[PDB]
Amino acid sequence: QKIPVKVVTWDEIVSLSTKLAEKIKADEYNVNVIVAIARGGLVPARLVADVLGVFDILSIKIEHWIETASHTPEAKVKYPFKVDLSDKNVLIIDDITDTGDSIELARKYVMENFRPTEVKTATLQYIKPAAKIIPDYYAEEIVSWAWFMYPWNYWEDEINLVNKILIERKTKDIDINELKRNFVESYGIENPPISLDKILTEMKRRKIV
Amino acid sequence: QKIPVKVVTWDEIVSLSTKLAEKIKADEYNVNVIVAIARGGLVPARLVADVLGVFDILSIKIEHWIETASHTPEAKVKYPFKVDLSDKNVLIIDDITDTGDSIELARKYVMENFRPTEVKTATLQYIKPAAKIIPDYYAEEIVSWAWFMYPWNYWEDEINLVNKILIERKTKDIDINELKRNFVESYGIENPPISLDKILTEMKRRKIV
Numbered sequence: 001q002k003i004p005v006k007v008v009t010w011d012e013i014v015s016l017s018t019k020l021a022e023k024i025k026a027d028e029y030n031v032n033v034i035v036a037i038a039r040g041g042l043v044p045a046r047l048v049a050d051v052l053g054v055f056d057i058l059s060i061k062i063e064h065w066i067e068t069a070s071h072t073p074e075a076k077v078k079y080p081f082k083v084d085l086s087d088k089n090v091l092i093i094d095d096i097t098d099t100g101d102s103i104e105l106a107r108k109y110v111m112e113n114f115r116p117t118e119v120k121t122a123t124l125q126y127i128k129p130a131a132k133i134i135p136d137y138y139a140e141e142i143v144s145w146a147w148f149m150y151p152w153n154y155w156e157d158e159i160n161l162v163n164k165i166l167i168e169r170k171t172k173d174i175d176i177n178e179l180k181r182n183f184v185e186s187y188g189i190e191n192p193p194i195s196l197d198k199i200l201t202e203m204k205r206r207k208i209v
Numbered sequence: 210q211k212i213p214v215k216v217v218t219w220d221e222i223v224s225l226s227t228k229l230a231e232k233i234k235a236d237e238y239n240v241n242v243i244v245a246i247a248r249g250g251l252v253p254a255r256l257v258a259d260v261l262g263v264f265d266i267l268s269i270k271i272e273h274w275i276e277t278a279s280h281t282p283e284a285k286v287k288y289p290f291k292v293d294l295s296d297k298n299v300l301i302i303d304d305i306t307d308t309g310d311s312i313e314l315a316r317k318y319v320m321e322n323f324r325p326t327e328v329k330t331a332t333l334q335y336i337k338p339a340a341k342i343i344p345d346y347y348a349e350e351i352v353s354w355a356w357f358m359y360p361w362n363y364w365e366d367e368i369n370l371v372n373k374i375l376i377e378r379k380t381k382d383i384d385i386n387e388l389k390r391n392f393v394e395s396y397g398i399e400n401p402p403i404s405l406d407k408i409l410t411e412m413k414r415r416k417i418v
């Protein structure tokens with residue numbers, strides 16, 4: 001019931017993305033086109049592009065589905081489309097490789113539908129114990145699984161982290177102090193980036209509570 | 210020869226994106242799909258999506274061309290594609306509306322090729338004196354033109370700001386000191402986010418110097 005959670009700051013993001021870009025520079029892979037995996041790869045993609053000097057960024061939206069009986073995970077491109085990337089070197093970027101299902105799909109999808117000269121993959125982080133596929137480049141290796149709460153994800157993650165606590169209440173009333181307490185107890189965050197009261201207001205607006 | 214330049218921080222970006230999202234909430238425009246304009250709108254798009262709770266983000270790459278004799282500006286979609294967005298409300302996002310050429314193209318392109326039920330435009334900033342087109346939503350109105358140096362653009366902008374000084378030199382100069390001095394004199398930046406020596410090394414790697 002405890003989930004190890006790490007709050008990632010903008011500075012750490014900048015540091016990771018820059019470190020990622022440096023590895024690509026040092027490998028002298030000449031990138032013409034970045035394909036960001038939406039939504040997680042949008043920010044890292046922009047930052048890496050700034051460091052490497054890439055002007056062409058495209059994105060594909062990859063969904064993550066779980067079959068509720070079998071619990072089978074499946075990644076899936078939504079709003080799929082084709083463009084002609086022949087004669088381009090492509091770099092695919094995402095935030096973090098966990099199982100590697102997303103980058104595996106992205107690579108396969110790009111090879112088949114964009115037809116680049118060459119394709120490489122890159123993520124800010126990479127979880128060694130969990131990854132079936134390892135990205136060509138990564139800034140930081142993670143040897144112990146944890147949920148990484150990125151600065152572009154603060155609202156969404158907190159909304160979910162709060163909901164995982166609320167769905168075990170046993171009282172259709174919501175006590176905020178109890179909530180804050182459980183947040184510290186379950187996740188180890190005493191000062192969430194977004195105050196839990198704002199989260200609750202937004203959860204109501206979204207009809208989650 | 211002096212260019213007014215404002216260095217925008219991550220916190221200001223967060224503040225702007227959140228303020229932008231709040232306007233959209235208050236207007237009760239129910240967004241199904243965000244179309245980010247690459248590259249400038251990628252980050253703001255992600256952040257606004259986090260605040261509003263939007264899961265579907267697509268992007269289109271808009272280029273900005275100038276004809277060198279006539280000086281005619283033209284915005285252009287690169288790697289154009291079509292997807293079916295019928296029955297969706299779309300929000301198009303970019304960093305800043307200057308002339309409004311980009312959002313005008315984006316809106317026209319999205320209406321014609323994605324065919325959404327409805328399309329609105331949004332930028333973090335909006336320059337009143339320059340904009341032919343005004344976005345449906347903006348976080349901050351600017352009444353006096355300035356170059357906004359965004360945190361996802363620090364390398365690129367500094368590379369250009371340095372180049373604009375170097376292309377008036379004297380004789381293949383070096384000296385990180387005169388450069389730094391001119392930077393302060395021309396732009397008013399005493400501490401660039403990226404150190405100028407860092408920029409120079411990267412300029413050589415890119416064969417700009």
Ligand SMILES: Nc1ncnc2c1ncn2[C@@H]1O[C@H](COP(=O)(O)O)[C@@H](O)[C@H]1O
Pocket residue numbers: 040064075094095096097098099100101102103145146147148149
């Ligand atoms: N440990 C984690 N922390 C934060 N985000 C994650 C984590 N694992 C997976 N994700 C998200 O899930 C997506 C898919 O990762 P994967 O399991 O490699 O397909 C990534 O793009 C991340 O946005």
Ligand SMILES: Nc1ncnc2c1ncn2[C@@H]1O[C@H](COP(=O)(O)O)[C@@H](O)[C@H]1O
Pocket residue numbers: 249250273284303304305306307308309310311312354355356357358
């Ligand atoms: N004053 C400015 N500061 C920073 N970026 C700008 C500025 N004006 C234009 N841009 C960039 O140029 C693009 C086109 O703006 P527009 O002139 O409205 O077509 C925007 O997406 C910005 O990324």
